[PDB]
Amino acid sequence: FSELLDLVGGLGRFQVLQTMALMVSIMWLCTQSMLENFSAAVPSHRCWAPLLDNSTAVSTSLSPEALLAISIPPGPNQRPHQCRRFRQPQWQLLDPNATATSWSEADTEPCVDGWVYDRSIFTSTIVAKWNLVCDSHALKPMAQSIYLAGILVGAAACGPASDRFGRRLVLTWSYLQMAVMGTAAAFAPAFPVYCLFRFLLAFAVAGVMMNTGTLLMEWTAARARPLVMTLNSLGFSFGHGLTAAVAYGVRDWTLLQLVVSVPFFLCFLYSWWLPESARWLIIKGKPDQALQELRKVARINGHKEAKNLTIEVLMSSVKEEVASAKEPRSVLDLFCVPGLRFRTCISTLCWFAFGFTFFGLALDLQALGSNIFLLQMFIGVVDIPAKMGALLLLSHLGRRPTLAASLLLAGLCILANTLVPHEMGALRSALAVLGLGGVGAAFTCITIYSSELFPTVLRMTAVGLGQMAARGGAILGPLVRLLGVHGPWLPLLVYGTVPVLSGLAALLLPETQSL
Ligand SMILES: O=C(O)CSc1nnc(Br)n1-c1ccc(C2CC2)c2ccccc12
Ligand SMILES: *[C@@H]1O[C@H](CO)[C@@H](O)[C@H](O)[C@H]1NC(C)=O
């Protein structure tokens, strides 16, 4: 196949522009996933009460602090209660002789008249729109889990459709679906409808993610392929900073979702000027069209040797890859070789731990640091050197020590974040950023490592099991926060424990770096 690329250019203008065009789309795709740190930010909130809020009433000399003491009981955080109010104004709390036990729980009622939300940071959020608070607290992580389950289902559906219809066609319509469904969610009338449209948006996110990487590799010479995939991975690192920058300017959830959805109408349009893969076209017995794509690429690269692309040269080079079709295989085969049985388990575990920890932590930055814009920016900025240093280390020290060290350090940083006292918010922010950086480095390490642990017959089946494990763990990520009602440290303890246990397990894997 690489002879056709050499007659067409395996690295050059076309590959450069293709890499740029796909990197930008991956940045915006990353913004789509990270959006609910801001679109679904929780404002500080309290019950609606007549004295505080019915401004049509008779004015008085009492200042808002006294009215807040008189109207709403204190809560766990040494702050006003977010879900209860006094049944009648408690004037007896105003005197200096008052005490904390001067009232009883029977004197308090829930927010019958609704909530009042802080508008200083955000104009609106889905939490404030649909009151995803108090008894409905679980609905935010439920929405995030529904999005990630959409990604799981979409990745399941993508493969067969990509093989049946082609990488570029499915990528094109995935772009269109992302644009439509992102626009539709921004105007949703109700919470279930918003969840439906976020699920259908993730369904297309999965296809974009898969077909972008596939369409890059199938047009890139093996010499440049690793660098190209590395740049594809850095697109998300820049997507984090892009999310912080865009969300800083747009403080309204509708406008934010709409703004991050519009770009995909442009991605849809310029996806038509891309060529379909010639490998896929020849494999499907379509040399008449593969030739057209090949000479399109050669024309872009300014390469004259399309004159030598007599159609037979296609039918005598790529044709015989179809020999691989004689033996389809399944996930269950991985565990039928006793030498691979344990290897498979402790690799899939690392994939699961990566996805679980990353989407446990990165989707509630509001719990990890005071300022979420700067914190998002930093989990973007640190991710870059983390990934590239992972590449450097595994190119020098090998795969096993790099994966083990990254996972262990990430887990131990996240555990420390619980141990550092709450007042030292700067150090907690730094440690959270370092933990997520270790998780990203572990993503790099496991992606490269899993492509080497298994025999050629099974490499892609093993990697598929790994990727599906990562998506399944990402689904469980958000739901662990429901443990937070028992204590703020418990979800973080779980998120820190999982990577430690998986990084200890990674010490048992065999090495694959060339000697
Ligand atoms: O959430 C899941 O379903 C499973 S992990 C997932 N899903 N979509 C994406 Br984007 N990722 C991703 C999550 C995290 C990262 C960086 C390394 C920390 C990624 C880097 C490149 C590509 C995808 C990534
Ligand atoms: C608000 O105060 C006005 C004062 O006249 C009163 O008429 C009205 O019923 C009050 N509404 C509520 C909801 O308390």
Curated annotation (Swiss-Prot):
Keyword Glycoprotein tagged: yes
Q: Name one Pfam family in it.
A: MFS_1
How is the protein altered post-translationally, as described in the entry? N-glycosylated.
Q: Name one GO molecular function term.
A: PDZ domain binding
Task: Report the SS bond pairs.
Answer: none
What would changing residue 70 to T do, according to UniProt? In RHUC1; uncertain significance; reduced urate transport; decreased localization to cell membrane
Membrane topology note: Multi-pass membrane protein
How is this protein annotated for GO cellular component? apical plasma membrane; brush border membrane; extracellular exosome; membrane; plasma membrane
What does the UniProt record say this protein does? Electroneutral antiporter that translocates urate across the apical membrane of proximal tubular cells in exchange for monovalent organic or inorganic anions. Involved in renal reabsorption of urate and helps maintaining blood levels of uric acid. Mediates urate uptake by an exchange with organic anions such as (S)-lactate and nicotinate, and inorganic anion Cl(-). Other inorganic anions such as Br(-), I(-) and NO3(-) may also act as counteranions that exchange for urate.
Which protein family is it in?
A: Belongs to the major facilitator (TC 2.A.1) superfamily. Organic cation transporter (TC 2.A.1.19) family.
| Protein name per Swiss-Prot or TrEMBL | Solute carrier family 22 member 12
Which organism was this protein described from? Homo sapiens
